[PDB]
Amino acid sequence: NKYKRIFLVVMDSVGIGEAPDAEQFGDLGSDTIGHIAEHMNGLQMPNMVKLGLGNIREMKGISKVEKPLGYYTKMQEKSTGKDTMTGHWEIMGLYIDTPFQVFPEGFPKELLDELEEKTGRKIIGNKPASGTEILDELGQEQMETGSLIVYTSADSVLQIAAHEEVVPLDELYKICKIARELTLDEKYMVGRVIARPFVGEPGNFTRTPNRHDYALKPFGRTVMNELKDSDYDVIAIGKISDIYDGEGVTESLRTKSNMDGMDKLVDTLNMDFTGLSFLNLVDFDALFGHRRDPQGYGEALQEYDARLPEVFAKLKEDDLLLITADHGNDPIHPGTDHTREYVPLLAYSPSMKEGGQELPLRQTFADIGATVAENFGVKMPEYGTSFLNEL
């Protein structure tokens, strides 16, 4: 193998400007990093800059360097959707025609009608809400009626809340499995059905650790599957395992924050493995992009950047670091959805003694999967063109 270990970091939602097909999505003008940089009066990301972020695109506080540490370019999404699952599935070598849906005005009556028809239970709520908001509003009604609180977030999810002392956990799980079947329908296609059991009393409801997720498997066998099948390590950090529903994963490390994600990345650098370590930094999307909070987003990017020099120090000659994103989520954009954007790609190994160069623009995110597959000599994905030889 050219590289013994590849460290792949997805800065979730960290887009680098509207894609050629942004108009289709109502995403004209979208620019995640650029708008944040403007809000911050210049972003402080000296390490990403050293890698060549400004060489991809110059933005406020983010300038090009003469000798970037590694190779750089951006990637264009080929799949139809701009959601997390589509982006990640494409990165690992797939092409996804059918987009996952979001529901800012709640779910269509037709879906909720069938769920009622199959479960024998009434549905209340049917809107985007945090767990706390929806429970304060409807928790008491739920307890008194045995109805199901159905709600969503800004992402492609269908969440079902029920009090553990009113709806048995096992019954809630059965209901979520029914909802999971009904939502395998392109009209209602949600990435994830989530059981949200809760306990307590009016004015004091708490969601329990008995949350269960019902995800769809990737629409194809991914480069991760092939790595696992060839006895390579595939270490998933953060939301990665969930995003792929465990497919191709050999070890999964849960994280609770971006900083914790970087700590686990550091943990994997200290591990003797051969294969892939794959981190998702989710705070960018979950805490800042969807909440349209450019200040919080900017601070998070600066916090992430400050962690990088330790990563640089731990990389070996036969390690490769890949940093990218899965879509945009411009925190100064209308609405709460993601934005259709190019994503940055930075590829760095300490063995690049003379620094890196510009790569041709990646015409699909699957170019990452193809590169990983070629490196480890496993079956090449159907989509994607490897840039391994360019490095």
Closest approach of Mn ion to the CB of residue 299, in Å: 19
Does 290 count as an annotated binding residue? yes
Q: Which is nearer to Mn ion, 155 or 226 (CB)?
A: 155
Q: Which is nearer to Mn ion, 78 or 163 (CB)?
A: 78
Residue of 226, 233, 326, 367 interacting with Mn ion (CB under 5 A): 326
- In the range 270-289, which residues lie near Mn ion by CB under 5 A? 285
Closest approach of Mn ion to the CB of residue 123, in Å: 24
Whether residue 166 contacts residue 173, with contact meaning beta carbons closer than 8 Å, is answered with: no
Closest approach of Mn ion to the CB of residue 84, in Å: 3
Residue in 269, 245, 383, 255 with CA at minimum distance from that of residue 321 = 269
Binding of Mn ion at residue 242 (CB under 5 A)? no
Closest approach of Mn ion to the CB of residue 159, in Å: 14
Binding of Mn ion at residue 26 (CB under 5 A)? yes
Residue in 309, 369, 290 with CA at minimum distance from that of residue 90 = 369
Q: Which is nearer to Mn ion, 107 or 198 (CB)?
A: 107
Does 21 count as an annotated binding residue? no
Does 212 count as an annotated binding residue? no
Number of residues that bind Mn ion (CB under 5 A): 7
Does 83 count as an annotated binding residue? no
Residue in 373, 374, 315 with CA at minimum distance from that of residue 348 = 315
Binding of Mn ion at residue 12 (CB under 5 A)? yes
Residue showing the smallest CB distance to Mn ion in the complex: 84
- In the range 52-91, which residues lie near Mn ion by CB under 5 A? 84
Residues in binding site: 12, 285, 290, 326-327, 338
Could you list the residues that contact Mn ion (CB under 5 A)?
12, 26-27, 84, 155, 285, 326
